């Protein structure tokens, strides 16, 4: 059902440490996260029973290695699907609910659980149990994920990867980069006794150019795996979603990315698994980032929302 | 005794230390392998060194991603196998630690009734433009503390 394309390259970097995920029908979204039980019961529908399929897209920008980005690619959608099913069952035991708080909680708990699995704080299952940390303590990854269903897009962001929505051929930021010099992030780090130091960019303790990530247990409690969540109902003028690592956003603005992606999709349709038009849009954004001098791995997912 | 420094006013200097539940010969056998710092340095991804390990040896280090820099060129300035002293200076790279020089000493100790090691590492470096001495020492200390933590873990895993 989902119409998407994904282009990724190590680029001019030696090894590839970006990872990506695109999982159609990965879970059912509990409708009690989108509308109240009272309103649906007014129409005779049981909000706890209704089924709405959802797909998950994710970009995971690893640093220190590829192992945490790959672990995120393999595990986040599984943990999120299980957490969503458990949450639907437990919402059947509750009255009216603050929906944004529960979206925040389910994504926060999912990201924290993946982080705990990476750092070896909890056991993980593959028919076999795993317990020791997946890799070294200075390996980490960003995680920008978008749950897509017919009526809503839900974005959870942790790190400096970014997702942008093209609406009315204009850019709408669905995630705010977790940069250490962000006023609230610096305030939090400094309140914990940490330092934000401008050392080739503002960095946590002068080392890491992001204030949140999955992994990086040597930088706790300053670098946390807590995502920022946005719930956005889909609209008439939605064109597409752009998820990408900073390999794109370092050299391409939100506006240029949205324009290029939307016009590439339309041009493919005029001129003529993954969808070819969205794949051409993602390939064009990748190659554009390369042409404008991006040093990094580049990973771009374009999701056609029409 | 070994970690004295006279940093000027364009420089800063500090030190870190770490106790390791391992005998001195093992910890020194790890840190003396100048051609292979990745044996305990958790940020090193590659290291290349030609020739014999002697004063004047030069190694080319690439570090892992996510860091403020990517590479470093490092010269062995002192090697004392009797008093267990190692001294290295950063002579090149794409980082902001100009004229960085470090001294690492290993000393015998008793820890939990067993042979142990006290490792001390001090440094002097130019303060790069746009930063303070406090920030530079804080940054280098964070990195050196990671290095000494990993050296402790590697040494103690070897003794076990
Ligand atoms: C991890 C690290 C980050 C940098 O920006 C500089 C440099 C590339 C030198 C590097 O090795 C520095 C290492 C340091 C300070 C000490 C050491 O390892 O003895
Ligand atoms: Mg990366
Ligand atoms: Mg990147």
Tab-separated table of C-alpha atoms and ligand atoms in Angstrom:
chain	number	residue	atom	x	y	z
A	1	UNK	CA	0.000	0.000	0.000
A	2	UNK	CA	2.623	2.655	0.913
A	3	UNK	CA	4.206	4.535	-1.989
A	4	UNK	CA	7.844	5.168	-1.131
A	5	UNK	CA	11.394	5.310	-2.392
A	6	UNK	CA	14.731	5.069	-0.619
A	7	UNK	CA	18.170	6.158	-1.846
A	8	UNK	CA	21.297	5.767	0.284
A	9	UNK	CA	25.052	6.016	-0.265
A	10	UNK	CA	28.177	6.148	1.848
A	11	UNK	CA	29.086	9.071	-0.413
A	12	UNK	CA	32.603	10.394	-0.030
A	13	UNK	CA	32.886	8.757	3.395
A	14	UNK	CA	34.930	5.577	3.725
A	15	UNK	CA	32.288	3.270	5.231
A	16	UNK	CA	28.495	3.345	5.331
A	17	UNK	CA	26.944	3.947	8.759
A	18	UNK	CA	23.510	5.204	7.718
A	19	UNK	CA	20.652	2.710	7.929
A	20	UNK	CA	17.014	2.905	6.917
A	21	UNK	CA	13.762	1.014	7.378
A	22	UNK	CA	10.501	0.847	5.431
A	23	UNK	CA	7.973	-1.626	6.838
A	24	UNK	CA	4.467	-1.687	5.345
A	25	UNK	CA	1.640	-2.809	7.638
A	26	UNK	CA	4.072	-3.093	10.547
A	27	UNK	CA	1.319	-2.624	13.142
A	28	UNK	CA	-2.260	-1.614	13.818
A	29	UNK	CA	-2.675	1.853	15.298
A	30	UNK	CA	-5.075	1.901	18.276
A	31	UNK	CA	-7.826	4.246	17.140
A	32	UNK	CA	-8.189	5.406	20.763
A	33	UNK	CA	-4.971	7.339	20.058
A	34	UNK	CA	-6.744	9.327	17.302
A	35	UNK	CA	-10.324	9.919	18.520
A	36	UNK	CA	-12.243	9.606	21.757
A	37	UNK	CA	-14.238	6.519	22.692
A	38	UNK	CA	-17.319	8.693	23.288
A	39	UNK	CA	-17.313	10.182	19.777
A	40	UNK	CA	-16.929	6.802	18.053
A	41	UNK	CA	-19.546	5.181	20.285
A	42	UNK	CA	-21.924	7.927	19.162
A	43	UNK	CA	-21.601	6.241	15.742
A	44	UNK	CA	-21.919	2.748	17.213
A	45	UNK	CA	-18.256	1.935	16.608
A	46	UNK	CA	-16.067	0.316	19.260
A	47	UNK	CA	-12.898	2.402	19.392
A	48	UNK	CA	-10.941	-0.368	21.127
A	49	UNK	CA	-11.834	-2.882	18.373
A	50	UNK	CA	-11.352	-0.830	15.191
A	51	UNK	CA	-8.324	-1.743	13.085
A	52	UNK	CA	-6.245	0.790	11.153
A	53	UNK	CA	-3.110	-0.478	9.352
A	54	UNK	CA	0.052	1.614	9.591
A	55	UNK	CA	3.491	1.598	7.951
A	56	UNK	CA	6.785	2.658	9.507
A	57	UNK	CA	9.605	4.597	7.836
A	58	UNK	CA	12.861	5.358	9.570
A	59	UNK	CA	16.307	6.848	9.031
A	60	UNK	CA	19.063	5.974	11.513
A	61	UNK	CA	22.336	7.898	11.239
A	62	UNK	CA	25.009	5.899	13.037
A	63	UNK	CA	28.251	7.285	14.457
A	64	UNK	CA	31.201	5.405	15.926
A	65	UNK	CA	30.177	2.491	13.722
A	66	UNK	CA	27.177	1.067	11.908
A	67	UNK	CA	26.029	-1.399	14.571
A	68	UNK	CA	23.546	0.780	16.469
A	69	UNK	CA	22.015	2.195	13.279
A	70	UNK	CA	21.557	-1.359	11.963
A	71	UNK	CA	20.143	-2.508	15.291
A	72	UNK	CA	17.628	0.344	15.113
A	73	UNK	CA	16.694	-0.635	11.550
A	74	UNK	CA	16.015	-4.195	12.716
A	75	UNK	CA	14.432	-3.561	16.136
A	76	UNK	CA	12.566	-0.249	16.396
A	77	UNK	CA	9.614	-1.326	14.260
A	78	UNK	CA	9.293	-4.634	16.147
A	79	UNK	CA	9.408	-2.989	19.578
A	80	UNK	CA	6.987	-0.280	18.438
A	81	UNK	CA	4.533	-2.815	16.986
A	82	UNK	CA	4.500	-4.845	20.211
A	83	UNK	CA	4.154	-1.689	22.326
A	84	UNK	CA	1.247	-0.463	20.190
A	85	UNK	CA	-0.581	-3.785	20.535
A	86	UNK	CA	-0.051	-3.801	24.313
A	87	UNK	CA	-1.204	-0.180	24.521
A	88	UNK	CA	-4.399	-0.938	22.593
A	89	UNK	CA	-5.181	-3.813	24.938
A	90	UNK	CA	-4.559	-1.615	27.987
A	91	UNK	CA	-6.592	1.275	26.547
A	92	UNK	CA	-9.480	-1.149	26.494
A	93	UNK	CA	-9.205	-0.928	30.309
A	94	UNK	CA	-9.296	2.894	30.501
A	95	UNK	CA	-11.700	5.786	30.058
A	96	UNK	CA	-11.009	8.962	28.139
A	97	UNK	CA	-7.327	9.647	27.608
A	98	UNK	CA	-4.935	12.436	26.714
A	99	UNK	CA	-3.835	11.196	23.312
A	100	UNK	CA	-0.670	13.235	22.793
A	101	UNK	CA	0.620	12.095	26.185
A	102	UNK	CA	0.159	8.448	25.224
A	103	UNK	CA	1.827	8.929	21.836
A	104	UNK	CA	4.721	10.530	23.727
A	105	UNK	CA	4.818	7.665	26.218
A	106	UNK	CA	4.657	4.801	23.723
A	107	UNK	CA	7.402	6.307	21.554
A	108	UNK	CA	9.526	7.260	24.583
A	109	UNK	CA	9.255	3.735	26.003
A	110	UNK	CA	10.006	2.132	22.627
A	111	UNK	CA	13.121	4.265	22.078
A	112	UNK	CA	14.236	3.705	25.682
A	113	UNK	CA	13.765	-0.054	25.313
A	114	UNK	CA	15.878	-0.154	22.161
A	115	UNK	CA	18.505	1.961	23.949
A	116	UNK	CA	18.486	-0.432	26.929
A	117	UNK	CA	18.895	-3.381	24.564
A	118	UNK	CA	21.843	-1.672	22.862
A	119	UNK	CA	23.566	-0.918	26.180
A	120	UNK	CA	22.883	-4.374	27.627
A	121	UNK	CA	20.679	-3.077	30.453
A	122	UNK	CA	17.876	-5.496	29.462
A	123	UNK	CA	17.812	-8.857	27.719
A	124	UNK	CA	16.852	-9.126	24.049
A	125	UNK	CA	15.466	-12.002	21.957
A	126	UNK	CA	16.451	-12.841	18.366
A	127	UNK	CA	14.650	-18.546	19.837
A	128	UNK	CA	17.607	-17.236	21.812
A	129	UNK	CA	18.233	-14.616	24.488
A	130	UNK	CA	20.901	-11.906	24.249
A	131	UNK	CA	22.148	-9.858	27.205
A	132	UNK	CA	25.542	-8.175	26.799
A	133	UNK	CA	25.729	-4.796	25.004
A	134	UNK	CA	25.412	-4.937	21.237
A	135	UNK	CA	28.627	-2.932	20.752
A	136	UNK	CA	31.042	-0.472	22.377
A	137	UNK	CA	29.960	2.441	24.553
A	138	UNK	CA	30.875	5.193	22.041
A	139	UNK	CA	28.658	3.834	19.237
A	140	UNK	CA	25.311	5.499	18.619
A	141	UNK	CA	22.697	6.484	16.096
A	142	UNK	CA	20.013	9.005	15.375
A	143	UNK	CA	16.469	7.761	14.903
A	144	UNK	CA	13.842	9.668	12.940
A	145	UNK	CA	10.727	7.579	12.379
A	146	UNK	CA	7.363	8.271	10.775
A	147	UNK	CA	4.315	6.114	11.344
A	148	UNK	CA	2.022	6.606	8.355
A	149	UNK	CA	-1.641	5.640	8.209
A	150	UNK	CA	-4.521	6.837	6.062
A	151	UNK	CA	-5.488	9.720	8.355
A	152	UNK	CA	-2.348	10.670	10.318
A	153	UNK	CA	1.434	10.836	10.299
A	154	UNK	CA	3.156	10.408	13.681
A	155	UNK	CA	6.813	11.416	13.884
A	156	UNK	CA	9.289	10.535	16.621
A	157	UNK	CA	12.717	12.151	16.357
A	158	UNK	CA	15.847	11.553	18.434
A	159	UNK	CA	19.005	13.221	17.113
A	160	UNK	CA	19.922	15.503	14.202
A	161	UNK	CA	18.310	13.589	11.391
A	162	UNK	CA	15.158	15.294	10.174
A	163	UNK	CA	11.769	14.652	8.592
A	164	UNK	CA	9.993	17.334	6.566
A	165	UNK	CA	6.455	17.365	5.190
A	166	UNK	CA	5.666	19.034	1.878
A	167	UNK	CA	2.212	20.588	2.299
A	168	UNK	CA	0.803	22.942	-0.302
A	169	UNK	CA	4.242	22.730	-1.977
A	170	UNK	CA	5.666	24.373	1.157
A	171	UNK	CA	7.926	22.898	3.860
A	172	UNK	CA	6.645	21.986	7.324
A	173	UNK	CA	9.243	20.800	9.832
A	174	UNK	CA	7.952	17.711	11.660
A	175	UNK	CA	11.057	17.409	13.853
A	176	UNK	CA	13.445	19.874	15.493
A	177	UNK	CA	17.109	18.862	15.429
A	178	UNK	CA	18.538	17.943	18.826
A	179	UNK	CA	21.547	20.258	18.655
A	180	UNK	CA	23.483	20.868	21.895
A	181	UNK	CA	23.220	24.663	21.556
A	182	UNK	CA	19.413	24.509	21.434
A	183	UNK	CA	18.416	26.592	24.448
A	184	UNK	CA	16.409	23.892	26.224
A	185	UNK	CA	18.972	21.187	25.413
A	186	UNK	CA	21.866	23.298	26.683
A	187	UNK	CA	19.845	24.165	29.792
A	188	UNK	CA	19.181	20.466	30.457
A	189	UNK	CA	22.809	19.425	29.893
A	190	UNK	CA	24.157	22.273	32.040
A	191	UNK	CA	21.625	21.496	34.774
A	192	UNK	CA	23.030	17.974	34.854
A	193	UNK	CA	26.521	19.434	35.335
A	194	UNK	CA	27.580	18.945	31.721
A	195	UNK	CA	29.241	21.285	29.273
A	196	UNK	CA	28.248	22.423	25.799
A	197	UNK	CA	31.442	23.518	24.052
A	198	UNK	CA	31.839	25.003	20.578
A	199	UNK	CA	34.522	22.672	19.175
A	200	UNK	CA	33.939	22.362	15.422
A	201	UNK	CA	30.285	22.995	16.147
A	202	UNK	CA	28.529	23.045	19.497
A	203	UNK	CA	29.081	19.637	21.088
A	204	UNK	CA	28.143	17.835	24.305
A	205	UNK	CA	31.330	17.956	26.410
A	206	UNK	CA	32.916	19.158	23.158
A	207	UNK	CA	32.637	15.636	21.696
A	208	UNK	CA	29.222	14.870	20.163
A	209	UNK	CA	27.347	17.288	17.905
A	210	UNK	CA	23.929	16.053	19.068
A	211	UNK	CA	22.187	16.179	22.442
A	212	UNK	CA	20.042	13.051	21.936
A	213	UNK	CA	20.713	9.660	20.358
A	214	UNK	CA	20.266	5.921	20.798
A	215	UNK	CA	23.368	4.331	22.295
A	216	UNK	CA	26.378	6.465	23.313
A	217	UNK	CA	26.159	5.195	26.886
A	218	UNK	CA	29.504	6.867	27.656
A	219	UNK	CA	27.790	10.269	27.300
A	220	UNK	CA	24.887	9.578	29.651
A	221	UNK	CA	23.072	11.243	31.277
A	222	UNK	CA	23.836	14.156	28.942
A	223	UNK	CA	22.878	12.353	25.702
A	224	UNK	CA	19.452	10.754	26.164
A	225	UNK	CA	17.332	8.511	23.910
A	226	UNK	CA	14.127	10.460	24.507
A	227	UNK	CA	12.267	11.328	21.285
A	228	UNK	CA	10.224	14.398	20.476
A	229	UNK	CA	6.853	13.362	19.052
A	230	UNK	CA	4.526	15.161	16.638
A	231	UNK	CA	1.034	14.016	15.597
A	232	UNK	CA	-0.061	15.534	12.287
A	233	UNK	CA	-3.425	14.750	10.675
A	234	UNK	CA	-3.076	14.323	6.938
A	235	UNK	CA	-4.440	17.131	4.782
A	236	UNK	CA	-5.714	17.866	1.291
A	237	UNK	CA	-2.488	19.598	0.197
A	238	UNK	CA	-0.044	16.909	1.375
A	239	UNK	CA	2.505	16.049	-1.327
A	240	UNK	CA	5.134	13.860	0.339
A	241	UNK	CA	7.305	13.172	3.377
A	242	UNK	CA	11.104	13.474	3.335
A	243	UNK	CA	13.112	11.570	5.942
A	244	UNK	CA	16.857	12.003	5.706
A	245	UNK	CA	20.082	11.951	7.663
A	246	UNK	CA	22.094	15.145	8.012
A	247	UNK	CA	23.983	14.077	4.877
A	248	UNK	CA	21.086	15.761	3.074
A	249	UNK	CA	20.103	18.560	5.473
A	250	UNK	CA	23.665	19.818	5.977
A	251	UNK	CA	23.727	21.070	2.362
A	252	UNK	CA	20.042	21.188	1.295
A	253	UNK	CA	17.335	23.300	2.908
A	254	UNK	CA	13.835	22.085	3.782
A	255	UNK	CA	12.418	24.268	0.990
A	256	UNK	CA	14.711	22.940	-1.746
A	257	UNK	CA	14.191	19.337	-0.625
A	258	UNK	CA	10.399	19.703	-0.712
A	259	UNK	CA	10.382	21.405	-4.118
A	260	UNK	CA	12.770	18.870	-5.665
A	261	UNK	CA	10.923	15.852	-4.242
A	262	UNK	CA	7.435	16.958	-5.273
A	263	UNK	CA	8.462	18.061	-8.755
A	264	UNK	CA	10.474	14.840	-9.283
A	265	UNK	CA	7.430	12.718	-8.414
A	266	UNK	CA	5.153	14.688	-10.743
A	267	UNK	CA	7.767	14.651	-13.521
A	268	UNK	CA	8.193	10.885	-13.288
A	269	UNK	CA	4.450	10.414	-13.667
A	270	UNK	CA	4.317	12.794	-16.647
A	271	UNK	CA	7.338	11.213	-18.364
A	272	UNK	CA	6.423	7.559	-17.686
A	273	UNK	CA	9.086	-2.934	-3.232
A	274	UNK	CA	9.875	0.701	-4.002
A	275	UNK	CA	7.778	3.071	-6.087
A	276	UNK	CA	9.552	4.356	-9.235
A	277	UNK	CA	8.467	8.016	-8.967
A	278	UNK	CA	9.310	8.266	-5.266
A	279	UNK	CA	12.511	6.296	-5.885
A	280	UNK	CA	13.514	8.807	-8.560
A	281	UNK	CA	12.768	11.648	-6.137
A	282	UNK	CA	14.942	10.062	-3.438
A	283	UNK	CA	17.731	9.343	-5.942
A	284	UNK	CA	17.622	12.954	-7.130
A	285	UNK	CA	17.846	14.278	-3.556
A	286	UNK	CA	20.783	11.936	-2.831
A	287	UNK	CA	22.651	12.951	-5.970
A	288	UNK	CA	21.869	16.620	-5.278
A	289	UNK	CA	23.421	16.380	-1.818
A	290	UNK	CA	26.483	14.754	-3.377
A	291	UNK	CA	26.739	17.520	-5.994
A	292	UNK	CA	26.568	20.278	-3.356
A	293	UNK	CA	29.602	18.925	-1.527
A	294	UNK	CA	28.150	16.788	1.272
A	295	UNK	CA	30.951	14.873	3.008
A	296	UNK	CA	28.734	12.391	4.848
A	297	UNK	CA	26.691	9.294	4.271
A	298	UNK	CA	23.409	10.310	2.646
A	299	UNK	CA	20.110	8.505	3.195
A	300	UNK	CA	16.793	9.785	1.851
A	301	UNK	CA	13.319	8.268	2.057
A	302	UNK	CA	10.554	9.971	0.088
A	303	UNK	CA	6.980	8.893	0.855
A	304	UNK	CA	4.339	9.958	-1.652
A	305	UNK	CA	1.294	10.927	0.412
A	306	UNK	CA	-1.204	11.207	-2.468
B	1	UNK	CA	57.587	13.545	39.810
B	2	UNK	CA	56.749	12.747	36.153
B	3	UNK	CA	53.679	14.832	35.206
B	4	UNK	CA	54.969	18.363	35.777
B	5	UNK	CA	54.117	20.898	33.123
B	6	UNK	CA	54.791	24.603	32.588
B	7	UNK	CA	51.985	25.678	30.245
B	8	UNK	CA	52.286	29.226	29.016
B	9	UNK	CA	49.350	31.633	28.817
B	10	UNK	CA	48.417	30.484	25.295
B	11	UNK	CA	48.340	26.879	26.554
B	12	UNK	CA	46.572	24.752	29.125
B	13	UNK	CA	47.513	21.632	31.058
B	14	UNK	CA	45.754	19.016	33.176
B	15	UNK	CA	45.858	15.327	34.069
B	16	UNK	CA	43.658	12.294	34.721
B	17	UNK	CA	44.352	9.054	36.559
B	18	UNK	CA	42.829	5.595	36.794
B	19	UNK	CA	43.245	2.557	39.041
B	20	UNK	CA	43.366	-0.785	37.228
B	21	UNK	CA	43.090	-4.220	38.846
B	22	UNK	CA	45.951	-5.612	36.759
B	23	UNK	CA	49.724	-5.999	37.198
B	24	UNK	CA	51.999	-3.295	35.839
B	25	UNK	CA	53.650	-5.544	33.254
B	26	UNK	CA	50.298	-6.222	31.554
B	27	UNK	CA	49.090	-2.606	31.466
B	28	UNK	CA	52.501	-1.503	30.205
B	29	UNK	CA	52.500	-4.259	27.573
B	30	UNK	CA	49.262	-2.755	26.288
B	31	UNK	CA	50.226	0.926	26.337
B	32	UNK	CA	53.733	0.327	24.936
B	33	UNK	CA	52.330	-1.007	21.636
B	34	UNK	CA	52.601	2.396	19.984
B	35	UNK	CA	51.689	0.893	16.592
B	36	UNK	CA	48.325	-0.372	17.932
B	37	UNK	CA	46.614	2.232	20.141
B	38	UNK	CA	43.200	0.734	19.260
B	39	UNK	CA	44.015	-2.108	21.675
B	40	UNK	CA	42.645	0.209	24.370
B	41	UNK	CA	41.756	3.531	22.707
B	42	UNK	CA	38.016	3.311	21.941
B	43	UNK	CA	37.961	6.131	19.362
B	44	UNK	CA	40.712	4.773	17.073
B	45	UNK	CA	39.401	3.061	13.926
B	46	UNK	CA	42.724	2.613	12.101
B	47	UNK	CA	46.402	3.120	12.843
B	48	UNK	CA	49.403	2.811	10.526
B	49	UNK	CA	53.026	2.786	11.692
B	50	UNK	CA	56.189	1.720	9.853
B	51	UNK	CA	59.486	0.608	11.331
B	52	UNK	CA	60.592	-0.157	14.862
B	53	UNK	CA	58.991	1.370	17.947
B	54	UNK	CA	61.525	3.995	19.024
B	55	UNK	CA	61.713	7.663	19.916
B	56	UNK	CA	60.785	9.414	16.686
B	57	UNK	CA	58.264	6.778	15.594
B	58	UNK	CA	55.249	8.301	13.848
B	59	UNK	CA	51.774	6.799	13.649
B	60	UNK	CA	48.819	7.818	11.473
B	61	UNK	CA	45.519	7.407	13.320
B	62	UNK	CA	42.018	7.609	11.906
B	63	UNK	CA	39.290	8.030	14.493
B	64	UNK	CA	35.689	6.878	14.333
B	65	UNK	CA	32.848	9.093	13.117
B	66	UNK	CA	30.893	11.515	15.300
B	67	UNK	CA	34.056	13.236	16.664
B	68	UNK	CA	35.280	16.822	16.087
B	69	UNK	CA	38.109	15.446	13.901
B	70	UNK	CA	38.950	12.469	11.702
B	71	UNK	CA	42.713	11.907	11.783
B	72	UNK	CA	45.842	12.554	13.802
B	73	UNK	CA	49.587	12.210	13.225
B	74	UNK	CA	51.435	11.360	16.404
B	75	UNK	CA	55.125	11.118	17.296
B	76	UNK	CA	56.645	9.026	20.082
B	77	UNK	CA	58.753	11.408	22.165
B	78	UNK	CA	59.645	9.280	25.186
B	79	UNK	CA	59.760	5.556	25.945
B	80	UNK	CA	61.099	4.348	29.312
B	81	UNK	CA	60.549	0.646	29.999
B	82	UNK	CA	62.207	0.800	33.437
B	83	UNK	CA	60.147	3.622	34.965
B	84	UNK	CA	57.232	2.920	32.558
B	85	UNK	CA	56.895	6.349	30.953
B	86	UNK	CA	55.418	7.059	27.523
B	87	UNK	CA	55.265	10.472	25.880
B	88	UNK	CA	53.549	11.347	22.607
B	89	UNK	CA	53.103	14.593	20.683
B	90	UNK	CA	50.471	15.407	18.062
B	91	UNK	CA	52.403	16.636	15.019
B	92	UNK	CA	49.550	16.645	12.526
B	93	UNK	CA	45.929	15.929	11.706
B	94	UNK	CA	42.680	17.788	11.070
B	95	UNK	CA	41.916	18.521	14.737
B	96	UNK	CA	42.208	21.594	16.962
B	97	UNK	CA	44.761	20.279	19.485
B	98	UNK	CA	47.847	22.105	18.242
B	99	UNK	CA	51.175	21.282	19.900
B	100	UNK	CA	49.469	18.683	22.065
B	101	UNK	CA	51.924	16.659	24.128
B	102	UNK	CA	51.029	13.975	26.655
B	103	UNK	CA	52.871	11.971	29.312
B	104	UNK	CA	51.577	8.636	30.640
B	105	UNK	CA	53.119	6.865	33.637
B	106	UNK	CA	52.231	3.465	35.103
B	107	UNK	CA	52.895	2.660	38.773
B	108	UNK	CA	52.521	-0.504	40.877
B	109	UNK	CA	49.944	-0.673	43.645
B	110	UNK	CA	47.820	-3.033	45.712
B	111	UNK	CA	44.092	-3.125	44.916
B	112	UNK	CA	41.730	-5.410	46.855
B	113	UNK	CA	44.716	-7.396	48.106
B	114	UNK	CA	45.925	-8.072	44.552
B	115	UNK	CA	48.546	-6.536	42.238
B	116	UNK	CA	47.178	-3.361	40.663
B	117	UNK	CA	48.252	-0.406	38.563
B	118	UNK	CA	47.846	3.363	38.839
B	119	UNK	CA	47.915	5.048	35.413
B	120	UNK	CA	48.388	8.813	35.184
B	121	UNK	CA	48.204	10.844	31.982
B	122	UNK	CA	48.887	14.579	31.771
B	123	UNK	CA	49.016	16.918	28.800
B	124	UNK	CA	49.874	20.377	27.508
B	125	UNK	CA	48.154	21.903	24.486
B	126	UNK	CA	47.540	25.244	22.828
B	127	UNK	CA	44.094	26.669	23.539
B	128	UNK	CA	42.435	27.017	20.108
B	129	UNK	CA	40.999	30.366	19.078
B	130	UNK	CA	37.450	30.837	20.334
B	131	UNK	CA	37.779	28.577	23.387
B	132	UNK	CA	38.989	28.939	26.963
B	133	UNK	CA	41.552	26.949	28.927
B	134	UNK	CA	38.716	25.467	30.999
B	135	UNK	CA	36.861	24.170	27.934
B	136	UNK	CA	40.028	22.715	26.379
B	137	UNK	CA	40.980	20.878	29.566
B	138	UNK	CA	37.389	19.644	29.976
B	139	UNK	CA	37.322	18.241	26.424
B	140	UNK	CA	40.723	16.548	26.617
B	141	UNK	CA	39.865	15.158	30.059
B	142	UNK	CA	36.629	13.615	28.787
B	143	UNK	CA	38.520	11.860	25.984
B	144	UNK	CA	41.417	10.724	28.195
B	145	UNK	CA	38.966	9.399	30.788
B	146	UNK	CA	37.306	7.294	28.092
B	147	UNK	CA	40.747	6.034	27.040
B	148	UNK	CA	41.803	5.097	30.584
B	149	UNK	CA	38.429	3.463	31.289
B	150	UNK	CA	38.823	1.261	28.224
B	151	UNK	CA	42.450	0.483	29.151
B	152	UNK	CA	41.250	-0.610	32.595
B	153	UNK	CA	38.556	-2.828	31.076
B	154	UNK	CA	40.961	-4.430	28.581
B	155	UNK	CA	43.661	-5.030	31.207
B	156	UNK	CA	41.237	-6.460	33.774
B	157	UNK	CA	39.639	-8.692	31.145
B	158	UNK	CA	43.113	-9.985	30.306
B	159	UNK	CA	43.948	-10.765	33.945
B	160	UNK	CA	40.625	-12.566	34.537
C	1	LIG	C1	39.374	11.184	20.075
C	1	LIG	C2	40.071	12.482	19.656
C	1	LIG	C3	39.184	13.675	19.292
C	1	LIG	C4	39.817	14.865	18.561
C	1	LIG	O1	39.131	15.752	18.160
C	1	LIG	C5	41.330	14.917	18.331
C	1	LIG	C6	41.999	13.564	18.093
C	1	LIG	C7	41.732	13.190	16.633
C	1	LIG	C8	43.517	13.717	18.268
C	1	LIG	C9	41.444	12.391	18.935
C	1	LIG	O2	42.303	11.296	19.165
C	1	LIG	C10	42.024	13.017	20.245
C	1	LIG	C11	42.445	12.215	21.284
C	1	LIG	C12	43.021	12.783	22.603
C	1	LIG	C13	42.605	14.181	23.061
C	1	LIG	C14	43.865	12.102	23.380
C	1	LIG	C15	44.393	10.691	23.092
C	1	LIG	O3	43.715	9.846	22.454
C	1	LIG	O4	45.529	10.361	23.523
C	2	LIG	MG1	26.874	8.888	10.684
C	3	LIG	MG1	25.399	11.932	9.098
